């Protein structure tokens, strides 16, 4: 049972890394078979299909993202500092993405938006976790006098997500961290100047 | 004739581009390109040596289309800030009318090519560098005219604008709502008008 659970874990883990780089359609099952020692058969002992593996792999990738944000946001007391910590998680993707190939939420978004309802919904669910996190921080901050009462929480969330993800895209194309540094500095300054209260 | 061949190539490249924009390069099979062009495989590869060369030509086509769209969007403004905000407005207009079916081909090709294909990556980078040069030229013009604060870092602004607007294109498509593009536009237009514009 342990062998099974660990072999499933290495299959999903390696699948997620390869999918994150070449996409679902462009990652050949044979290469995942190759990357897991299953070149002579047996990947279907753990998954019914490549599509089921894709969903499991995305869930794995989403868990890594979730862990990166949970660690990044822990320990801050002031709600604005916590929101800035959220920016810093994305900032750190320039050289340290959640897994090889960059942000799997951004990567899967581009592939699935016009091709795959189930992956679309899984991407949207993660985006919605992020919106909920920011909404809750803004609400608590407003209540504590740390954030201005007029701040539109979801508008702020959508701006942060768009800016940081677009910068993640740019940083891997331009092969430099500078877009992420600039996007971070812009939003941190904006937040401190226009969102923060005390 | 050679004229007919040049036209046939144009048609194939245009159809390939639309398919690749949706399903990607690896996910678009030659049989899909056949169906969309009404051509047999041999009819396509008479004009292209390979799927790879076709993919490159299809991107160059997508790049030119994006270029035309910015060209019309940016033409004729009387103030450099108006011109920079019109660059945002081009992206905002993607909400209902992307440059081609399936969204921004620069964004879409970036995500696929960045860790897979040096030649497409270089082409994507060249497009991003054109946008950066456009915005830098406008910023230096505006500074010369007293329209833009001299302290404005042009390339910092360019990369912020591109990151924001492209991230919003991604979000608007995945959330199935224009709202992220509208918010991004408003945020940047307001920021530029309040902090970049001098007079
Ligand atoms: Mg797409
Ligand atoms: Mg990629």
From TrEMBL, chain B:
InterPro entries: Homeodomain-like_sf (IPR009057), HTH_TetR (IPR001647), Tet_transcr_reg_TetR-rel_C_sf (IPR036271), TetR_C (IPR011075). Keywords: DNA-binding, Metal-binding, Transcription, Transcription regulation. Mg(2+) binds at residues 111, 114-115. SUPFAM superfamilies: Homeodomain-like, Tetracyclin repressor-like, C-terminal domain. GO terms for molecular function: DNA binding; metal ion binding. The keyword Lipid biosynthesis does not apply. Residues 29-48 bind DNA. Residues 6-66 form the HTH tetR-type domain. This is Regulatory protein TetR. It comes from Chloroflexus aurantiacus (strain ATCC 29366 / DSM 635 / J-10-fl). The lineage of its organism: Bacteria, Bacillati, Chloroflexota, Chloroflexia, Chloroflexales.
